[PDB]
Design a protein around this nucleic acid. Sequence first.
RNA 1: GGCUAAGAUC
Lengths: 44, 851, 36, 34, 73, 82, 27, 103, 48, 28
Amino acid sequence: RRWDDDVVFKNCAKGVDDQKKDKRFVNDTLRSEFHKKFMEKYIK
Amino acid sequence: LELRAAVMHDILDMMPEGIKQNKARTILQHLSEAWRCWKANIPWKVPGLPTPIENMILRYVKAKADWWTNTAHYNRERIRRGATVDKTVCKKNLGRLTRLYLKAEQERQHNYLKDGPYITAEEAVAVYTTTVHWLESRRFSPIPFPPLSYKHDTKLLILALERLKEAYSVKSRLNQSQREELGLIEQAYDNPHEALSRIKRHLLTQRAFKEVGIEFMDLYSHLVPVYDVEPLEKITDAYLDQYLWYEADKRRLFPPWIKPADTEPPPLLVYKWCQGINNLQDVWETSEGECNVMLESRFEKMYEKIDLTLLNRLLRLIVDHNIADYMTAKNNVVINYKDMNHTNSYGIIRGLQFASFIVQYYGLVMDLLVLGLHRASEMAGPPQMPNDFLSFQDIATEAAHPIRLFCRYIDRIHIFFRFTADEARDLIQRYLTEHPDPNNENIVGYNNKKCWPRDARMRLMKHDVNLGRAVFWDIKNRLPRSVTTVQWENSFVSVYSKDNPNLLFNMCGFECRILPKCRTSYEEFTHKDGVWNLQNEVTKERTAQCFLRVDDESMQRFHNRVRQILMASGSTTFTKIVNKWNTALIGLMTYFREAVVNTQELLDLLVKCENKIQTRIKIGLNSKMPSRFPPVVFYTPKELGGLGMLSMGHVLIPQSDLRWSKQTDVGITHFRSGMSHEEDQLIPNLYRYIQPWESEFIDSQRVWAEYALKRQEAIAQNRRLTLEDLEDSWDRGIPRINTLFQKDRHTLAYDKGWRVRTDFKQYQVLKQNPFWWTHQRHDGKLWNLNNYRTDMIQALGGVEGILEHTLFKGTYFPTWEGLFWQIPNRRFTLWWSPTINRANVYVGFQVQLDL
Amino acid sequence: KKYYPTAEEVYGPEVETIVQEEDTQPLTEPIIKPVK
Amino acid sequence: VQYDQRLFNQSKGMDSGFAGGEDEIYNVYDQAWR
Amino acid sequence: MIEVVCNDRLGKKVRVKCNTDDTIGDLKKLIAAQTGTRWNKIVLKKWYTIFKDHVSLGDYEIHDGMNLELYYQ
Amino acid sequence: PAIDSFGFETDLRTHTQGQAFSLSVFHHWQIVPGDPLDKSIVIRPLEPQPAPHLAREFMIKTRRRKGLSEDVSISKFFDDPM
Amino acid sequence: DHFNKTILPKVMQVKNFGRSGRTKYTH
Amino acid sequence: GGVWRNTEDEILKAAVMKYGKNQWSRIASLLHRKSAKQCKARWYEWLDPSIKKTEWSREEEEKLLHLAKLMPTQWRTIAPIIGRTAAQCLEHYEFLLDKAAQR
Amino acid sequence: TSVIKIAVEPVNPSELPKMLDGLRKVNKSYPSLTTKVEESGEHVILGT
Amino acid sequence: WKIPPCISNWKTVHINENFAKLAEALYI
RNA sequence: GGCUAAGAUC
């Protein structure tokens, strides 16, 4: 109580805004979960 | 070859419409030009063709793209360590991932224009109002327009041109782009008013920029891009970054909440943060139900999800309208690859020279959203009396504060959130109601350090693990997902309670372990004299102890850096391989002075790598796998004709390598050095001849206090401070005192932000420069290893003992004095010819050359 | 975020298209005979 | 203050010292042996 | 005490520890104790330099690990 | 005592060169020394003593469940003076 | 064997890239 | 340097016809007056045959005025948005429209 | 009387009803095995 | 079944109303 | 005549 007063953004409550994760495979190898993680972890 | 032969087998079978002048190698050339067009991520297809022939060509191209992407991810997963061997696969894996990084940025920038992944325009008006309210509360004056007759523009132009010349042109550099770069620097140095008039017309009129080249660095752990810019626009951008940092030092527009600045970038990020955590109002005491939570996390999204509209509106609030349009247009010019040509205006280019002012713009913007407008006003204080990096206005300010400290890195962020008894129970109740976990799934995934995780890691209790989720959830929900998110995979929130006496935090260089003696701490091993005795500012006693172990990411980066020097053998000289490791070791041992002595895994990497390089350099001489190579052929300095390897490990010289012999008139006086009591080590480790940071910061406080007392005595008695008065006050202290007494002392003081600009300098240069610690201009030379070469020659057996193993007796020189000068490999192998060719160094051999 | 067409309308609502990734019987159930 | 002129301007500067990632300059041992 | 490794051809390679002032006649008795031949029928050689039968090991400066090419007479 | 009889059958066969064999049957209870309400007994976290402060260590070890948690001197909340 | 082999950091049996046997002879 | 003159445009049009459009080194081996980066800029801005180098009508002026408020910087991003794709005349048309509306 | 008491918890916390169903089936086999769920959530098992 | 050669290498609206809505809100 | 990092290339 009264610990977050000047907080502009109150609560997002949405990580991916459609589901908890992807949970859907696609034949496009570039637009998939494998190339999305390999371009985010190994690359910077 | 199998995909090419099956394509010809399919094209000759899948409907050629009989013998009707069928296809040839031009149809395979059409498939070859289609793959080369897709390889640069270009939208150029192969138009003007039959539909089944195009469908058969696109089917084999989509199958070849599945093979090439799977071969790229397989080599990248084995790129961290993988095999510790790479001859030509390193250039191919970097070139394949450069195509994937350019294609993913091209699809994301095309999605930003076509679709609308904006910056949440309803909340974006609040972020522009938050910066307008925070600047009005601090009453900071905006950055003025660049004057046409500025007296300070002469020193600002000389400081920026000196940084550009020392970075690019060092030694042995010649290129078609480096010729115009060094030519424009000399043309500006011979005419400062001509370059100042050109830089003024480039900012106030030219609201565009030329193309820039993106190239990824050769980092095996995580690739970092390097944005090569136009040579004319680089000198114009350097004047904008120098003038913005010079104006920010006078107007104080950058608060000390985000401190990567050039005060003390290794110690004050660690030691002043540890002393600040210990000098708080009853921080180590938690018997009254209190709890502490240190949340260490990186944003990892304030480099590509930047909004150009919000960055342009914040630049108009911070600087003039002419400087704001030039700064925003430089980040939206072009992203030119080796073959591709991607668009822009989707994020911020951090490779440009003006990226330091843009990083501090988001640094004050994101910290104001994470902490608060009324929160930051109570943290930094009024502009009539600003606070320090870890100070406060009064004791009542830090008492009623839920966030006691907030240190912000360029990418990371640290917050030592203090909670009371009722505040912790209220926060966990809001976290459980919004995110329940009935099957104890809240303690399923939780990161922990490697600093002996048996009694010193985070104690996975019930209330402690619940407060670890709650402190992170309030910080994650405080920031929006479009501006800057905070993932859990990169975060580490170690809580402190009655159940967990040990506290852990990963600092900017390494991991630190705070454990007070009064709170029944951990096993307290203390493998060396590297345990910091953090004292309280009030009691001035042993408040808490601080352990400083090296980080795992820096140890993996050093293991990759030692692997690059080991893989470079054979294709270079033997002296170049030793000089590459000596610069890599001095950069690691000086920055980890107390950490390298108190880490058993770090010393095991040094003894394995130094034995590998002595194995690597011995193979280049001969390839018969020698039994006992002499250590005097490696540890001799370059003045006495040696490789000069810094021995950071116990490599003891044998007793059969310290005997001299000379026959002048009477007989062969066989001399021998007497040190056979216990052991005769060749050279001590570099940690013994380098001052630790705890002893350096303790001596620096006595250094400037004696300096301020002597300067006050010289000002009162009206006397000149001579060199004899500053003899014992010359050592080092906080910053090298000789840096204040330099010939360019008047010019170096007018260039603020030395540590911040050097951090992005490695992000913009092609080679991974190990200058992230400090620079010799502002900070000065600290690792003075002049007493190491005097001890290395005296332990090896003197100048006569080192020359006895050489071919000095055959050269016929009556006095050992200064006589120095495949070609350097030939002179080194012939100099140590009696040392590298004997019966003990090579056992089974009777080969005679000739008559 | 992302933007992609759903597979429910392409393959029809009748055919329950499943997409199994991993983590099912790591070389134990078809390897040896089951414990009867 | 007004210090003596022998102490000030004793050396040059305006350089970062460790110039780039060129690990072939032998930056250690700033003073010669003999 | 030097560990002279009498490493001949075709697998016959043994270690022979002898004193520094020990004669070469004592070395052939120790080399035959690990090889399995008569010590009178062993001729040590180092590029056509047949050693004597009366010169001590300290005169040849044979240090530790100085291997020898053994041959049979 | 069953609090320290764990592996007593395994220890009786090990030290007696394998020529012994013991079986544990249930027996009536007896009061352990010390008192759980007694204070000024700092129990060690590891390797405890055979000192008669075992009841304070047994009450703190019984605090893994709910009810009699740490700081077990709250019996005056149920036994307030008058 | 002239060294004491106790000041040395963890163990140095053979530094010639051939340590097949992994033993110290205490067990 | 490399202002894409009449002599440079004829050499760039010959290299785009004979050598190729995606060969900056081949165009650099036949001009010897500007860099390869300047030849790629001249082939896209000045010597581009598909570049609309005229017709700054009211439909293009209103599109440039609407894109000016929507994006004050990023003239390279606003050049195919207006359809002119000049990336240098867009700043010139914005300068002429501001000079006409200066009053 | 089953004086000995040993606690039992699964390694993966997602398999909580799988260990709860096994403790119910083990209580039916052995008569003296009285699986008493403690107040702290730790599934205890009384043994002889 | 014609086979034309292929030699080219060296050998919907592009706008959104959310971008104008974000700019007008920042202008207001 | 194919695949190799517009193959790097003034």
